Amino acid sequence: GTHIDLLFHPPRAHLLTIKETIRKMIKEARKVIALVMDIFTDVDIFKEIVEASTRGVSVYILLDESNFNHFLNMTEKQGCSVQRLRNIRVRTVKGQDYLSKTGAKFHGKMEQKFLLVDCQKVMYGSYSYMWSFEKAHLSMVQIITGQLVESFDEEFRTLYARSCVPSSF
Amino acid sequence: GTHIDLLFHPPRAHLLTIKETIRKMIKEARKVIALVMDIFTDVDIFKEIVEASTRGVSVYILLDESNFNHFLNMTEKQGCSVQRLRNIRVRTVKGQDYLSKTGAKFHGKMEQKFLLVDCQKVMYGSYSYMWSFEKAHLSMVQIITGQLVESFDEEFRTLYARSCVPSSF
Numbered sequence: 001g002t003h004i005d006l007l008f009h010p011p012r013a014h015l016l017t018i019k020e021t022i023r024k025m026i027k028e029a030r031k032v033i034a035l036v037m038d039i040f041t042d043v044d045i046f047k048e049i050v051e052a053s054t055r056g057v058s059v060y061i062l063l064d065e066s067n068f069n070h071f072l073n074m075t076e077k078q079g080c081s082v083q084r085l086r087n088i089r090v091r092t093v094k095g096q097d098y099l100s101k102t103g104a105k106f107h108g109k110m111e112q113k114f115l116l117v118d119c120q121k122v123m124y125g126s127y128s129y130m131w132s133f134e135k136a137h138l139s140m141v142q143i144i145t146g147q148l149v150e151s152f153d154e155e156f157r158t159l160y161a162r163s164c165v166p167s168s169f
Numbered sequence: 170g171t172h173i174d175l176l177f178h179p180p181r182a183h184l185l186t187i188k189e190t191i192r193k194m195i196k197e198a199r200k201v202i203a204l205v206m207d208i209f210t211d212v213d214i215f216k217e218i219v220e221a222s223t224r225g226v227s228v229y230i231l232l233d234e235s236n237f238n239h240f241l242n243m244t245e246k247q248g249c250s251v252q253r254l255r256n257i258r259v260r261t262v263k264g265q266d267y268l269s270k271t272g273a274k275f276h277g278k279m280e281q282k283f284l285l286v287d288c289q290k291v292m293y294g295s296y297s298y299m300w301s302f303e304k305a306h307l308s309m310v311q312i313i314t315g316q317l318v319e320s321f322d323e324e325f326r327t328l329y330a331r332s333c334v335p336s337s338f
């Protein structure tokens with residue numbers, strides 16, 4: 001009991017763009033939005049998420065740690081102190097710890113991108129929320145309903161357990 | 170009529186790693202292998218592909234254009250002249266053309282990756298074929314069978330039509 005449709009950017013035969021479909025998914029949220037994202041600088045999508053939170057939807061956002069300052073820089077340019085919105089929680093996730101041949105320890109990246117709404121619908125794929133995915137790159141997503149959604153819910157909870165409050169905050 | 174399994178790196182409750190499952194998929198190929206990838210420098214996966222082509226399997230590889238010289242350099246360091254293997258065709262795909270802030274003309278990237286074997290099984294997800302995905306990053310893939318695989322076959326053909334002979338050749 002899993003159904004999957006495919007969408008592309010630039011768009012193919014389907015009516016809506018990927019960005020338009022993300023806005024739709026967010027406006028349709030009744031209870032909860034769970035987002036995992038590597039880089040988030042798109043202001044239009046950010047505005048939709050803030051608007052959802054003001055109507056009482058709980059919003060949980062997991063961002064790649066090494067790219068977090070891109071998001072912070074965007075929210076401050078918009079005049080938003082996101083750390084004051086009680087209905088939104090933002091946390092960061094690191095990759096694996098590894099030691100370089102010059103001995104300096106480093107961590108890698110969380111390479112994972114999905115949007116999970118009301119524990120019932122997922123958008124999963126290669127589209128990141130930044131201007132280069134509108135204008136420059138070719139990407140694709142899946143829209144997923146049914147039994148597979150439960151696996152994305154489990155994986156969200158697992159990343160949430162691992163995540164940390166961002167050090168700026 | 171689509172079945173989907175998830176695998177993670179580092180691995181969870183599955184017996185094989187993502188890299189071991191990619192090797193398995195290529196060894197099991199009887200007729201055709203179709204690969205779309207952004208960066209390919211993993212020697213062990215390259216060796217499995219060459220071995221499949223010597224068995225008579227037809228191999229089509231589509232690489233992101235900007236990153237192509239990293240692949241060619243790996244093949245040359247292995248002492249292989251990949252140009253001379255007739256059962257493998259390697260071609261490049263570019264993203265969209267666009268103008269920058271200063272008016273200059275650039276192209277973006279093909280942000281897509283998947284492995285399609287015998288028109289019947291797909292591995293789709295965020296794992297790229299390089300050392301950093303083994304040691305540094307967190308990633309995930311889907312193993313897909315059934316009706317959705319036909320959609321990946323159509324998309325491979327569409328990307329193949331767009332693709333170019335690499336300028337380095």
Ligand SMILES: Nc1ccc(-c2ccc(CO)o2)cc1
Pocket residue numbers: 008009010138139140280281324327328331
């Ligand atoms: N001629 C042409 C134009 C665009 C694409 C396209 C959009 C998204 C993706 C990634 O699968 O490919 C393929 C071929």
Ligand SMILES: Nc1ccc(-c2ccc(CO)o2)cc1
Pocket residue numbers: 111112155158159162177178179307308309
């Ligand atoms: N504690 C812990 C360890 C590893 C992961 C992991 C690997 C790949 C992905 C992407 O979904 O997540 C999550 C939590």
